[PDB]
Amino acid sequence: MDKNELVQKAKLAEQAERYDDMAACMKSVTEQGAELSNEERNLLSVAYKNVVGARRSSWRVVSSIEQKTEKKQQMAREYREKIETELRDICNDVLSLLEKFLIPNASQAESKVFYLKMKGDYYRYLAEVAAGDDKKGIVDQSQQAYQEAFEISKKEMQPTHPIRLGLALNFSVFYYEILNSPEKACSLAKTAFDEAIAELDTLSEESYKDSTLIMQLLRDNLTLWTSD
Amino acid sequence: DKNELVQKAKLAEQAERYDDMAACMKSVTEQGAELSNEERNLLSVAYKNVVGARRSSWRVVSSIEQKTEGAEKKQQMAREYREKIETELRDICNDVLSLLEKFLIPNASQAESKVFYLKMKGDYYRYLAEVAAGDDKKGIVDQSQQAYQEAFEISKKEMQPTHPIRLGLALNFSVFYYEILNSPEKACSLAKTAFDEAIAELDTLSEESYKDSTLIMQLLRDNLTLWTS
Amino acid sequence: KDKAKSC
Amino acid sequence: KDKAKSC
């Protein structure tokens, strides 16, 4: 169909909580080669976040079972692998859209940071299930994506920008969960938070709720990565 | 093999991958052997989730299709999407109903199994009825009613009023009367009877089903008060 | 309507 | 440790 029709259909899918449909619609919109509007951009994000999120959730469940178990463990192992394949395909799907459309077509700094963040995210998800002579590359792919987004965001965006704050959140999570570097993870989270807090006046009546939420998520991870 | 598919179905459920779970239990059922209570419940839970999802989505989009009257292009999109969901919904239901006619119901040797699968037959025809419009609806509604009715008869005759399966049958039968047949009083009367009947004989409860029975009894009264307030 | 509870 | 929250 056409952009608007696909965008509305994707909105319907989301309402129906049918994120495969939503992701498929937004993928088709993206494949139309045109730079995505903020709305379309967010739809694509939300859709694949749910799609990958399911496999990620399932992966952890099965993974936690494969380890806590012979004939059973072999079955659980094969099932986990099955989920991983789904998980990876999804990630590679997103990452492909990012290399071919989103990142290149990103004209404004805002778009650039957003898609670079997304690239880091899904390489991070790949990293979550990476083991061996692929894990190292994957982890570095994510880091470099995050790092570039982080640089651009600091230079072109105010500390309270939802995209910048969201980047800090996920970048911090990457350092802790992927790189096993708590202090680095915490410092990044603490910095983004404190910087934003000191400048809550730059907020926008259309982004304040997004910014404030992300700030709460930042501190949450921070307290998590300290108490036990 | 049975055990392997059943174990895999337990894994699928843990991962909340109910399509996988339904597929495993479907394969188990297709092995032609009568299902154990465990296998029976796995099959039930799986498809309840599989169909439950499409039903939830259906209501959301349907509720949107109506809320966009006068908005031609919006309403047409919601309608078409709704239709798409319906097709999935029906396939799921017909899948289950087929398993019930070819394996579960016939292979049902005990009254308990008979009531359970007849209830299940009523349930999924009801789900078909939920999205039926036109010629097919009348037949569909009668399939459900007849499935329910036989199960209801058998359950009253072979099961104590506090049996989870009997109580659960009464619950869904009542819902059928209200939502499908638009017969509130009949729906309420069936629910109230099952409840009161179970209450008068709480001694027939079992140390392994009293929680299920008491919950269903609570769901019964809940529907009752809903259909009044 | 408000979908009633089923089992 | 538990899974951290993200966007």
Author numbering:
A (entry chain A): 1 to 69, 73 to 231
B (entry chain B): 2 to 230
C (entry chain R), D (entry chain Q): 341 to 347
From the reporting publication:
The three Rnd proteins, Rnd1, Rnd2, and Rnd3 (also known as RhoE) are a subfamily of the Rho GTPase family with atypical properties (Foster et al., 1996; Riou et al., 2010). They are constitutively GTP-bound because they have amino acid substitutions in key residues involved in GTP hydrolysis, and have a very low affinity for GDP. 14-3-3 proteins are regulatory molecules that bind many functionally diverse proteins, usually by interacting with Ser/Thr phosphorylated residues. Here we demonstrate they are inhibited by 14-3-3 proteins, which use a novel hybrid III/IV 14-3-3 mode to simultaneously engage the C-terminal farnesyl group and the adjacent phosphorylated serine residues.
